[PDB]
Design an enzyme around this catalytic site. Structure first.
Site, PDB file in Angstrom:
ATOM      1  N   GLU A   1       0.987  -0.398  -0.082  1.00  0.00           N
ATOM      2  CA  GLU A   1      -0.128  -0.003  -0.292  1.00  0.00           C
ATOM      3  C   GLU A   1       1.236   1.466   0.890  1.00  0.00           C
ATOM      4  O   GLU A   1       0.442   2.249  -0.430  1.00  0.00           O
ATOM      5  CB  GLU A   1      -0.775   0.161   0.656  1.00  0.00           C
ATOM      6  CG  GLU A   1      -0.578   0.522   2.707  1.00  0.00           C
ATOM      7  CD  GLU A   1      -1.369   1.020   3.485  1.00  0.00           C
ATOM      8  OE1 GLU A   1      -2.108   1.638   4.306  1.00  0.00           O
ATOM      9  OE2 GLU A   1      -2.885   0.187   3.671  1.00  0.00           O
TER      10      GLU A   1
ATOM     11  N   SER B   1      -7.983   5.905   7.843  1.00  0.00           N
ATOM     12  CA  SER B   1      -9.036   5.295   9.700  1.00  0.00           C
ATOM     13  C   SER B   1      -7.650   5.745  10.244  1.00  0.00           C
ATOM     14  O   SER B   1      -8.020   6.376  11.323  1.00  0.00           O
ATOM     15  CB  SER B   1      -9.018   4.036   9.318  1.00  0.00           C
ATOM     16  OG  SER B   1      -9.034   3.059   7.848  1.00  0.00           O
TER      17      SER B   1
ATOM     18  N   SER C   1      -0.199   6.932   8.232  1.00  0.00           N
ATOM     19  CA  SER C   1       1.130   6.486   7.761  1.00  0.00           C
ATOM     20  C   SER C   1       2.129   7.760   7.565  1.00  0.00           C
ATOM     21  O   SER C   1       1.353   8.670   7.365  1.00  0.00           O
ATOM     22  CB  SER C   1       1.317   5.499   7.054  1.00  0.00           C
ATOM     23  OG  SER C   1       0.293   4.765   7.553  1.00  0.00           O
TER      24      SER C   1
ATOM     25  N   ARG D   1       8.648   3.952   5.738  1.00  0.00           N
ATOM     26  CA  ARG D   1       7.701   4.553   6.456  1.00  0.00           C
ATOM     27  C   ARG D   1       7.775   5.107   8.071  1.00  0.00           C
ATOM     28  O   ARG D   1       9.098   3.688   8.453  1.00  0.00           O
ATOM     29  CB  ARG D   1       6.308   3.134   6.711  1.00  0.00           C
ATOM     30  CG  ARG D   1       5.627   4.076   7.797  1.00  0.00           C
ATOM     31  CD  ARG D   1       4.348   2.474   7.691  1.00  0.00           C
ATOM     32  NE  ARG D   1       3.433   2.579   8.249  1.00  0.00           N
ATOM     33  CZ  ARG D   1       3.090   2.451   9.623  1.00  0.00           C
ATOM     34  NH1 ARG D   1       4.043   2.474  10.482  1.00  0.00           N
ATOM     35  NH2 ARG D   1       1.396   2.854  10.025  1.00  0.00           N
TER      36      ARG D   1
HETATM   37  N1  LIG Z   1     -17.581   9.037   2.123  1.00  0.00           N
HETATM   38  C1  LIG Z   1     -17.312   8.459   3.793  1.00  0.00           C
HETATM   39  N2  LIG Z   1     -17.072   7.219   4.375  1.00  0.00           N
HETATM   40  C2  LIG Z   1     -17.024   7.614   5.318  1.00  0.00           C
HETATM   41  N3  LIG Z   1     -15.270   7.772   6.035  1.00  0.00           N
HETATM   42  C3  LIG Z   1     -15.510   9.039   4.966  1.00  0.00           C
HETATM   43  C4  LIG Z   1     -16.330   9.290   3.775  1.00  0.00           C
HETATM   44  N4  LIG Z   1     -15.199  10.774   2.914  1.00  0.00           N
HETATM   45  C5  LIG Z   1     -14.002  10.802   3.723  1.00  0.00           C
HETATM   46  N5  LIG Z   1     -14.162   9.638   5.177  1.00  0.00           N
HETATM   47  C6  LIG Z   1     -13.153  10.194   5.592  1.00  0.00           C
HETATM   48  O1  LIG Z   1     -11.798   9.294   4.630  1.00  0.00           O
HETATM   49  C7  LIG Z   1     -11.028   8.568   6.034  1.00  0.00           C
HETATM   50  C8  LIG Z   1     -10.920   7.183   4.757  1.00  0.00           C
HETATM   51  O2  LIG Z   1      -9.628   8.219   4.459  1.00  0.00           O
HETATM   52  P1  LIG Z   1      -8.618   6.834   3.386  1.00  0.00           P
HETATM   53  O3  LIG Z   1      -8.128   7.317   2.810  1.00  0.00           O
HETATM   54  O4  LIG Z   1      -9.740   5.957   2.240  1.00  0.00           O
HETATM   55  O5  LIG Z   1      -9.188   5.272   4.542  1.00  0.00           O
HETATM   56  P2  LIG Z   1      -8.485   3.784   4.180  1.00  0.00           P
HETATM   57  O6  LIG Z   1      -7.490   3.945   3.307  1.00  0.00           O
HETATM   58  O7  LIG Z   1      -9.373   3.361   4.159  1.00  0.00           O
HETATM   59  N6  LIG Z   1      -8.252   3.196   5.684  1.00  0.00           N
HETATM   60  P3  LIG Z   1      -6.911   2.499   6.146  1.00  0.00           P
HETATM   61  O8  LIG Z   1      -6.571   1.083   5.916  1.00  0.00           O
HETATM   62  O9  LIG Z   1      -5.814   2.700   7.212  1.00  0.00           O
HETATM   63  O10 LIG Z   1      -5.978   2.824   4.268  1.00  0.00           O
HETATM   64  C9  LIG Z   1     -12.353   8.053   7.178  1.00  0.00           C
HETATM   65  O11 LIG Z   1     -11.824   8.366   8.669  1.00  0.00           O
HETATM   66  C10 LIG Z   1     -12.975   9.765   6.979  1.00  0.00           C
HETATM   67  O12 LIG Z   1     -12.346  10.112   8.213  1.00  0.00           O
HETATM   68  C1  LIG Z   2      -1.079   0.778   7.284  1.00  0.00           C
HETATM   69  C2  LIG Z   2      -2.829   1.149   8.298  1.00  0.00           C
HETATM   70  C3  LIG Z   2      -3.587   0.446   8.129  1.00  0.00           C
HETATM   71  C4  LIG Z   2      -2.123   1.978   9.431  1.00  0.00           C
HETATM   72  N1  LIG Z   2      -2.093   2.975  10.196  1.00  0.00           N
HETATM   73  C5  LIG Z   2      -1.991   3.003  11.065  1.00  0.00           C
HETATM   74  C6  LIG Z   2      -0.768   2.357  12.185  1.00  0.00           C
HETATM   75  C7  LIG Z   2      -1.269   2.877  13.634  1.00  0.00           C
HETATM   76  C8  LIG Z   2       1.008   3.074  13.981  1.00  0.00           C
HETATM   77  O1  LIG Z   2       0.842   3.232  12.890  1.00  0.00           O
HETATM   78  N2  LIG Z   2       0.918   2.697  15.587  1.00  0.00           N
HETATM   79  C9  LIG Z   2       2.703   2.965  14.923  1.00  0.00           C
HETATM   80  C10 LIG Z   2       2.933   3.713  15.478  1.00  0.00           C
HETATM   81  N3  LIG Z   2       2.530   3.529  17.463  1.00  0.00           N
HETATM   82  C11 LIG Z   2       3.277   3.622  18.857  1.00  0.00           C
HETATM   83  C12 LIG Z   2       2.380   3.401  19.587  1.00  0.00           C
HETATM   84  C13 LIG Z   2       3.233   3.885  20.974  1.00  0.00           C
HETATM   85  C14 LIG Z   2       4.349   4.246  20.904  1.00  0.00           C
HETATM   86  C15 LIG Z   2       5.403   4.192  22.028  1.00  0.00           C
HETATM   87  N4  LIG Z   2       5.779   4.187  23.181  1.00  0.00           N
HETATM   88  N5  LIG Z   2       4.903   4.484  19.792  1.00  0.00           N
HETATM   89  N6  LIG Z   2       4.375   3.683  19.317  1.00  0.00           N
HETATM   90  C16 LIG Z   2       0.610   3.418  16.791  1.00  0.00           C
HETATM   91  C17 LIG Z   2       0.365   3.326  15.972  1.00  0.00           C
HETATM   92  C18 LIG Z   2      -0.939   1.464  11.887  1.00  0.00           C
HETATM   93  C19 LIG Z   2      -1.555   0.687  10.420  1.00  0.00           C
HETATM   94  F1  LIG Z   2      -1.328  -0.382   9.685  1.00  0.00           F
HETATM   95 MG   LIG Z   3      -5.671   3.724   2.879  1.00  0.00          MG
END
Ligand SMILES: Nc1ncnc2c1ncn2[C@@H]1O[C@H](COP(=O)(O)OP(=O)(O)NP(=O)(O)O)[C@@H](O)[C@H]1O
Ligand SMILES: CC(C)c1ncc(CC(=O)N2CCN(c3ccc(C#N)nn3)CC2)cc1F
Ligand SMILES: [Mg+2]
Ligand SMILES: Nc1ncnc2c1ncn2[C@@H]1O[C@H](COP(=O)(O)OP(=O)(O)NP(=O)(O)O)[C@@H](O)[C@H]1O
Ligand SMILES: CC(C)c1ncc(CC(=O)N2CCN(c3ccc(C#N)nn3)CC2)cc1F
Ligand SMILES: [Mg+2]
Lengths: 352, 352
Positions: free
Chosen positions: A121, A175, A178, A190
């Site tokens: 990703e 969600s 990153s 990353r």
């Molecule tokens: N129509 C929608 N429905 C839900 N969320 C939305 C919408 N439009 C905007 N958002 C916002 O966009 C965020 C999701 O962004 P997005 O980049 O598509 O994440 P994702 O790829 O689905 N999650 P991840 O697996 O963590 O990368 C949600 O957490 C909301 O804050």
């Molecule tokens: C790729 C997408 C699905 C995705 N988006 C976000 C995360 C969260 C993340 O990347 N983290 C790392 C850093 N982390 C902490 C926590 C405590 C300490 C202390 N003390 N330090 N770091 C928090 C969670 C994961 C992930 F797969």
């Molecule tokens: Mg995403």
């Protein structure tokens, strides 16, 4: 085979679809009815079922890709509705990224003879971002910033050149968050991430206000006053904390005034929505600032769909990054910000 | 004049009081009745009115300070009740720190002839921390860590030597968070801060669960399952995200499963309390990790009253800092963690 790129995230599926526009007379006869029905369905509708949407304003027109000319379309729907998508498919080489490329691998293989190619990703994100900026947004800049972000009477969206994009800090707000450091087209990492992302905004907002959509949450936030929920520096000091240059208006404790029962009984849902937005957005900005300082990178580009139709958070990021970095960091934004992984996946098609 | 140090924070007032225990026969006659009544009131009661508390377990016994021997007492009450405190005073040189030393300056001056000396809250914090560790906790270590924090069958509080404490990253978790880098007894700075602190935990917890105290919020959290509210990496990927070493159990989006209405209808208040605690604690740890990396400091000490009677957050910090730093950072804790500013203020008395 239609040319598609899919990014199955935790919340949204993003789909990039290349519509050929140079179809010869011989090619139209050779095309099978199912293919023609798919192309017609996708290009004659902007809503797909009850939850799919084509972002028509993002279409790249007359793009040359893999030696053909066509239009690049951008389509999204909730990951919760992927079973509907797959069931429609059962009624092609699919390059897929995001966590759902792994989680739903076995589901995609219920489509007979389908070849699923899982791609990383953050590889796809970097490749898609660099590609879209390179081809431009129908001749306009893909990248923009907010000029004079500290002065509301002047603050305005302005184009920004990324012809030499390196180095670049990319903050992917999905969600969760990153944070990537991009040093070249083939050298990126990353840096870290946070759990306080768009799903925190939407999830907390729904719990606190009863809103039932991202757009409703933003509508509420636009009407609210976050200072009714937050405790500010001036609530603690009576004014600025001068020794460390903390202005009275800075948030000292997000939701910190909600420790008082009478303030919980007076706060509005709109106030709570805005405090949730401000809390999440400032934390993202602050983490981005710390990462930029450690990576020695001064351009910070924010992507992901947390910022879709969300000018409030974009302007807060532009102002906050500039203010708290004393002008050393610049917040950048991209017109195609939610779709880069899907494009990068599509771009992997020639490898298979 | 009684010897007092006061730290008036956004939420709690902390008071350090030196009780002389070497009072000679001549000195007891010379002492005025109001002074004797104050000393007796403070030392014969552990609860003061309805909201004041003496933390008797923290008392330093037979301490030598300013050339006298005495007991150092540690007392706290809510800043909301400072008017009661001041009104009781109206019925002395006061060294005071925290934002309230400024906000309530004019109120302290309603006590006739009282001399208020405002001292900086991070100057006092560093001075008080270094002093208490130097005199020890009645012969025991003031500083401790959790050994083998990643293994619950082994994890245990253990003493830690700070005889050469520099350099040190100090994470002050009050209403919000201040992060300090201490290079010497006279060379320290505020690196940055965050708005996501103890007031966020308490404020959000109260909104989400209806709890009416910090202790009730922790009791709820101890019974809850944060994964009912949070979206984990395995919820998005189906397992680990191996490319970037993200384990399936890591939180990808705090409260991220609350975007689904049916999950909001099934989650318990205890689950929400625990998710609030985990969200705040992990963010504090992550910010501390980034600051430690940028400051090139590998010992991180956490203070402030967010961690009072809060072993859950302390153990989460110990585990998370060690895990996410791959063992390069160590989480440290201090027995007198909420009181260092009040002690540092008391220590400024000889300058006036
Ligand atoms: N129509 C929608 N429905 C839900 N969320 C939305 C919408 N439009 C905007 N958002 C916002 O966009 C965020 C999701 O962004 P997005 O980049 O598509 O994440 P994702 O790829 O689905 N999650 P991840 O697996 O963590 O990368 C949600 O957490 C909301 O804050
Ligand atoms: C790729 C997408 C699905 C995705 N988006 C976000 C995360 C969260 C993340 O990347 N983290 C790392 C850093 N982390 C902490 C926590 C405590 C300490 C202390 N003390 N330090 N770091 C928090 C969670 C994961 C992930 F797969
Ligand atoms: Mg995403
Ligand atoms: N009895 C209590 N009442 C309120 N909060 C408590 C209590 N006990 C522990 N806490 C926690 O301790 C936090 C306050 O810590 P503290 O270090 O005393 O901050 P403060 O100095 O009052 N605030 P600040 O001005 O930002 O430094 C609260 O936000 C709670 O999370
Ligand atoms: C001394 C006590 C009362 C206290 N406790 C905490 C704070 C909060 C704090 O210190 N900050 C600075 C960093 N900040 C951001 C925000 C956005 C960005 C971007 N983009 N960067 N930084 C957030 C708030 C204040 C404060 F007075
Ligand atoms: Mg404090």
């Amino acid at each position: 085979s239609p040319w598609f790129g899919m990014d199955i995230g935790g919340t949204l599926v993003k789909l990039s679809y290349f519509e050929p526009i140079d179809i010869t007379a011989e090619e139209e006869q050779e095309e099978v009815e199912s293919l023609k029905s798919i192309r017609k369905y996708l290009t004659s509708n902007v809503a797909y079922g009850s939850t799919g949407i084509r972002d028509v304003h993002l279409e790249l027109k007359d793009l040359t890709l893999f030696g053909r000319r066509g239009n690049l379309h951008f389509i999204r729907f909730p990951t919760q509705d992927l079973p509907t998508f797959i069931q429609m498919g059962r009624d092609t080489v699919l390059c897929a990224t995001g966590g759902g490329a792994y989680k739903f691998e076995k589901d995609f293989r219920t489509i007979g003879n389908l070849h699923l190619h899982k791609l990383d990703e953050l590889d796809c994100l970097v490749k898609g971002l660099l590609y879209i900026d390179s081809v431009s947004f129908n001749g306009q800049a893909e990248c923009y910033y907010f000029a004079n972000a500290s002065e509301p009477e002047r603050c305005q969206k302005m184009p920004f050149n990324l012809d030499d994009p390196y180095p670049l800090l990319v903050v992917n707000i999905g969600s969760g968050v990153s944070i990537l450091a991009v040093h070249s087209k083939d050298n990126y990492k990353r840096v870290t991430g946070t759990s306080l992302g768009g799903g925190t905004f939407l999830g907390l907002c729904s719990l606190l206000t009863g809103c039932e959509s991202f757009e409703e949450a933003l509508e509420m936030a636009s009407k609210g006053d976050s200072t009714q929920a937050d405790k500010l520096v001036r609530d603690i000091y009576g004014g600025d904390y001068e020794r460390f240059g903390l202005p009275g208006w800075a948030v000292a404790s997000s939701f910190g005034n909600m420790i008082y029962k009478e303030k919980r009984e007076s706060v509005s849902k709109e106030d709570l929505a805005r405090a949730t937005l401000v809390t999440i957005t400032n934390n993202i900005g602050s983490v981005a600032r710390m990462c930029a300082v450690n990576e020695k990178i001064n351009r910070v580009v924010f992507v992901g769909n947390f910022l879709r139709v969300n000018t409030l958070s974009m302007k807060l990021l532009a102002y906050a990054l500039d203010y708290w970095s004393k002008g050393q960091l610049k917040a950048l934004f991209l017109e195609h910000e939610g779709y880069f992984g899907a494009v990068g996946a599509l771009l992997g098609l020639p490898n298979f």
